[PDB]
Design a protein around this ligand. Structure first.
Ligand SMILES: Nc1ncnc2c1ncn2[C@H]1C[C@H](O)[C@@H](COP(=O)(O)OP(=O)(O)OP(=O)(O)O)O1
Lengths: 492, 327, 195, 66, 71
């Protein structure tokens, strides 16, 4: 796979043979075990990569070491790695860089050493999926062949990663097990039985338990009923599991529980009132969980959290409103999703001006009902610091009447997905002296949106790329087709 | 009861192949109790029925302060064959994935304790479109017809172009288009479509199916799918939109009227003066005539005997847009 | 309900260019029949694999005349009996080169004529006539001459110009194979216009 | 100990002439800036020192840089 | 799959049935050395061909009743 170093090493290895078929065939099927002998220490590919390993800081050594836990060329999501690093404690923090941004700069510290390479990147420059070259991968495996981080054969392991379809193969699990991760190769689902998930709850010292693509036999309420035996558990991403309807009610003694993730699980009816009192939460992440009764009451009671996605603000005598969001002075990512008019309240419409450390807002008006929601959105004012916003289904026809450089000057990135939006209001331009200072713009699927191009270029002087791909009605932009396909307009 | 068995099996098939197709990153499906859609459709047996097909049946309905549209898969037809269960599940997955585009009929939720799942969609006050038009007690103005032709052209181009795997809905048909309050057309029923593999615009299927008179006889002979096999069916679609005659028609003799043969002979002999619809002749048709016949020349251009003479679907939708932008 | 009807239509089937009723019994089930044996099978056993036989001269065209003669039993003495599955796998062979035939609402899956044996008006409509039958018999003739003044229908025996079946069969083809339905031929002329 | 040198073999170097061309037209514009500085960034054992040796052992660079 | 060498010792051979039944024993297509060494047959064993074993490098034939090689 492309490296000239490994190719010249294999050439120097095969140069001292007799060119008969059998050693060539077995080197073709036993490959890694010879380049780690280095023809008994003469060419040393492993040294030339291990010297790049051996100048990391020690926490970055621990963070890069967990990528020996994945299959051959799987495309690893960033978010799962960052949550594992926050969970089992490879990341320390005191000076405000508390949870998410420390995972961000640890991940950027690894990708800036050219150890982890990216796969795809959004309009806003953020990274979602990453992979590694396989020589780095079996280097990290051979370093995990040391201290019992990842054995994966035999007894002594400190944490374990499950591949696909272990319903019948009976992975050995001892009582050490500081983590259990689920590694899938972008599309498979780990077929799991009940007894392995019962033996997961037998591990006394288990800090990371993320189950990302698995189908179980029984409902998860009685499977994970004995998680009271789990005491020092830090993370749970119960994303994308079939039998999950109600997470178990023995979740009162989990007093550590630094994050809690359950994304894209469409059947999550009740969230228990025990996710109020433990006050040491960092990330609560319910994105796109449709059937959900939209929260418990004391969300503003716990204060040390940073990410709150899929809020679903409740009705009058229901759940929780937007009033306690003023109490959450530490969050920096926030995700709203709105259904009808009585989701929000009148004097709570200024609930988003005192969030000092807020960075991004996502608004998901997917299952919108009436024009009362459209009239009541237009008073929700974001703070004057705001880095990214993504309104994405938005049943209104005009702009939301705060989308102006006066109400938010420091906006840099912005995307608009599907919508009933027809045109932008006059505050959206505001070109007497103020301008957007915006840099990345995305218009995904808009069949009613009409505006010009040079008016944008005289209203947005700091653009770099504008990615629009389904807008059959402009035909004035510089990209190849604003209609059916898409371009980026990467200017000079 | 046994409803748990329905649930724990149907959704496992469901989740496994939507992770296989979409990697989970998808749309907010809302679950249900049974009784909401049971009393919403009045226990499946009422006058709230919209329209049927082989596998499924479309009902209207009403859950608390919102009317919805409900799609059930009939038990006997899907249980007689035991191997074509997967067209149901990729119908639900493709209807989930196409819901972020405006010209489709968005999946709002699913209940999955039933035959196999039962789907729910947002409301459209005009029903499905008939062999001629509205299934309401009714007459459609012609600008509305040109607009909805443009819209389901956009939707078919969205299937062909938006992904590295080309979805080809071979059953493009006037029976699948719905119409809302604002007469915006919305396709549905992606159960019959297949995904081409990546990079290749041509593979062979191994059976041929779907509604006589929309076949692409190229595909009926050869049994391999290209995107032009969709273009021919779309051509007969907007033929039915204009003329208002069914694609299978009779005049007293064996029930045989090849409608596109009739339109091409009235083109070459009757000279385009008879395709303007005796329920629509009282329209002003001042400059509307020349663009009616521009649409007819376009539709006959996209139903020619060789696919090299047919335009690609992107082009067809572009020149439809030019036609309505002529005025 | 399914039994006296079988007595009705199988009681009228006795014709030498059909597959004769070798298997008729109680037969409470669906088709599991073995009309015992066929020595050569269909024409795909000789035309489309190149190890069994080479093609003949004007020999198999009279076997096609025999298949046409079975169709003159089919379409004429009927009230409504239409064979509806004309392709080269259904015309069969004996050791004496004998043609034989066998295997007599809205369905989405198309099975009738999944290749070039289908009528264009049948693809457009789905009503199956005896004139769609003569169209399909025409493409049967096209296949047995061709193998899917440029008379290069053969690649092995290219001296059929004095044999005159090229001329008469091309006349029957190019008159039979027109895409309309109101100048359609009939099987008796297809018999008598080569002998 | 690890070290490097401008001495290489220039026969086993499998094609780099597009990158060599691009870096030569980068070096031809050195007077446009006050001090042109450039970076070759990649993982370990990728071709960085070899493309550097391929660049400044060319003749035209020695015509330019003394 | 991993076979390298074959030695055949037809020393105390009895009848022509052995000669007829040897000729169906086909070695794998990878084969580095073979040594048939007493071999009562008169012709070649009818697999000794570059088609049946392409990668043969070394080969010995000891004593035998072998007369000529086949085509
Ligand atoms: N294009 C090439 N053609 C032939 N051999 C090459 C090519 N590129 C690199 N090599 C060989 C030369 C050396 O044997 C080996 C290492 O290359 P080298 O340039 O020294 O690594 P590098 O500079 O990319 O990284 P590092 O300096 O960290 O080792 O690869």
């Amino acid at each position: 796979k492309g490296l000239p170093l490994t190719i010249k090493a294999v050439g120097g290895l095969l140069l001292c043979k007799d060119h008969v078929y059998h050693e060539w065939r077995r080197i073709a099927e036993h490959f890694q075990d010879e380049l780690r002998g280095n023809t008994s220490e003469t060419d040393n590919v492993m040294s030339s990569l291990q010297l790049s390993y051996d100048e990391l800081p020690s926490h970055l050594k621990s963070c890069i070491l967990t990528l020996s836990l994945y299959p051959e060329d799987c495309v690893i999501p960033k978010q799962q790695l960052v949550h594992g690093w926050i969970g089992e404690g490879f990341v320390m923090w005191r000076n405000g860089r508390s949870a998410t941004e420390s995972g961000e700069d640890c991940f950027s510290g690894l990708t800036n050493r050219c150890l982890i390479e990216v796969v795809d990147k959004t309009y806003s420059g953020t990274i979602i999926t990453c992979k590694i070259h396989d020589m780095v991968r079996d280097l990290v495996i051979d370093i995990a062949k040391k201290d019992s981080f990842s054995n994966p054969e035999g007894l002594n392991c400190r944490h374990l990663g499950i591949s696909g379809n272990f319903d019948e193969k009976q992975i050995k699990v001892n009582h050490k097990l500081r983590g259990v991760v689920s590694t899938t190769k972008t599309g498979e689902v780990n077929k799991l039985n009940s007894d392995l998930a019962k033996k997961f709850t037998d591990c006394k010292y288990l800090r990371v338990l993320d189950i990302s693509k698995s189908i179980f036999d029984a409902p998860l309420s009685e499977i994970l009923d004995e998680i009271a035996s789990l005491q020092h558990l830090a993370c749970l991403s119960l994303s994308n599991t079939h039998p999950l309807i109600q997470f178990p009610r023995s979740m009162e003694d989990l007093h550590n529980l630094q994050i809690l993730d359950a994304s894209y699980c469409q059947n999550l009816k009740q969230l228990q009132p025990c996710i109020v009192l433990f006050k040491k939460l960092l990330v609560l992440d319910m994105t796109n969980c449709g059937s959900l009764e939209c929260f418990p009451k004391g969300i503003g009671s716990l204060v040390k959290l940073e990410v709150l996605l899929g809020f679903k603000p409740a009705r009058s005598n229901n759940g929780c409103k937007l009033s306690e969001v003023k109490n959450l002075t530490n969050l920096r990512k926030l995700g709203l999703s709105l259904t009808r008019g009585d989701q929000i309240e009148e004097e709570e419409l200024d609930s988003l001006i005192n969030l000092s450390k807020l960075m991004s807002i996502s608004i998901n008006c997917y299952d919108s009902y009436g024009d009362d929601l459209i009239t009541k959105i237009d008073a929700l004012t974001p703070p004057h610091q705001l880095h990214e916003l993504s309104l994405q289904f938005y049943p209104g026809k005009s702009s939301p009447s705060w989308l102006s450089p006066h109400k938010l000057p420091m906006l840099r990135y912005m995307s608009i997905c599907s919508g009933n939006l027809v045109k932008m209001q006059e505050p959206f331009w505001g070109n007497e002296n103020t301008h957007w200072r915006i840099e990345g713009l995305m218009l995904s699927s808009l069949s009613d949106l009409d505006m010009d191009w040079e008016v944008l270029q005289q209203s947005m002087p700091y653009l770099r790329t504008v990615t629009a791909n389904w807008c059959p009605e402009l035909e004035s932009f510089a990209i190849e087709d604003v209609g059916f396909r898409g371009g980026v307009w990467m200017k000079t | 009861d046994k409803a748990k068995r329905w649930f724990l099996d149907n959704g496992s098939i469901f989740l496994r192949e939507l992770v296989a197709d979409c990697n989970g990153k998808s749309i907010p499906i809302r679950s249900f109790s049974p009784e909401q859609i049971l009393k919403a459709t009045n226990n499946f047996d009422s006058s709230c029925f919209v329209s049927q097909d082989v596998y499924y049946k479309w009902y209207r309905g009403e859950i608390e302060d919102r009317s919805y549209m409900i799609k059930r898969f009939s038990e006997d037809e899907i249980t007689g064959k035991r191997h074509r269960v997967k067209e149901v599940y990729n119908d639900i997955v493709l209807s989930a994935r196409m819901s972020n585009h405006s010209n489709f009929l968005q999946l709002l939720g699913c209940c999955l304790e039933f035959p196999f799942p039962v789907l729910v969609f947002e409301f459209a006050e005009h029903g499905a479109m008939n062999q001629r038009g509205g299934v309401i007690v009714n007459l459609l103005p012609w600008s509305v017809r040109l607009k909805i032709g443009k819209e389901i052209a956009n939707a078919v181009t969205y299937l062909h172009t938006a992904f590295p795997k080309i979805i080809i809905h071979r059953d493009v048909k006037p029976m699948h288009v719905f119409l809302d309050k604002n007469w915006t057309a919305k396709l549905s029923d992606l159960s019959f479509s297949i995904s081409l593999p990546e990079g290749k615009s041509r593979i062979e299927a191994e059976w041929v199916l779907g509604t006589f008179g929309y076949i692409d006889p190229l595909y009926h002979k050869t049994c391999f799918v290209t995107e032009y096999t969709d273009v021919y069916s779309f051509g007969i679609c907007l033929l039915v939109i204009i003329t208002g005659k069914p694609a299978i028609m009779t005049i007293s003799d064996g029930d045989l009227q090849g409608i596109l043969s009739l339109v091409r002979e009235l083109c070459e002999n009757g000279k385009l003066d008879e395709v303007i619809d005796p329920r629509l002749m009282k329209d002003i048709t001042s400059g509307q005539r020349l663009q009616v016949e521009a649409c007819v020349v376009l539709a006959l251009r996209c139903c020619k005997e060789r696919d090299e003479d047919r335009p690609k679907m992107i082009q067809v939708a572009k020149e439809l847009k030019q036609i309505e932008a002529s005025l | 309900k399914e039994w006296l009807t079988e007595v009705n239509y199988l009681g009228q089937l006795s014709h030498p260019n059909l597959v004769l009723l070798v298997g008729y019994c109680a037969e409470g089930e669906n088709r599991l029949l073995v009309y015992e044996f066929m020595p050569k099978g269909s024409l795909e056993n000789h035309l489309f694999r190149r190890g069994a036989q080479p093609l003949t001269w004007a020999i198999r065209m009279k076997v096609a005349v025999g298949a046409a003669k079975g169709l003159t039993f089919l379409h004429e003495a009927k009230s409504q009996v239409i064979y509806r599955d004309f392709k080269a796998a259904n015309i069969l062979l004996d050791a004496d080169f004998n043609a034989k035939l066998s295997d007599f609402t809205h369905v989405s899956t198309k099975v009738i004529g999944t290749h070039g044996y289908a009528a264009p008006e049948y693809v457009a409509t789905g009503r199956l006539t005896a004139k769609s039958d003569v169209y399909s018999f025409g493409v049967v003739l096209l296949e047995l001459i061709s193998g899917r003044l440029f008379r290069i229908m053969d690649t092995k025996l290219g001296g059929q110009y004095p044999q005159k079946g090229a001329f008469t069969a091309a006349n029957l083809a190019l008159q039979c194979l027109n895409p309309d339905a109101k100048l359609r031929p009939k099987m008796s002329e297809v018999l008598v216009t080569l002998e | 100990d690890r070290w490097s040198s401008p001495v290489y073999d220039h026969t086993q170097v499998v094609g780099l002439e597009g990158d060599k061309r691009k870096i030569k037209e980068w070096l031809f514009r050195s007077n446009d800036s006050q001090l042109l500085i450039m970076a070759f960034v990649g993982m370990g054992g990728l071709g960085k020192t070899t493309i550097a040796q391929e660049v400044f052992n060319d003749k035209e660079i020695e015509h330019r840089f003394e």
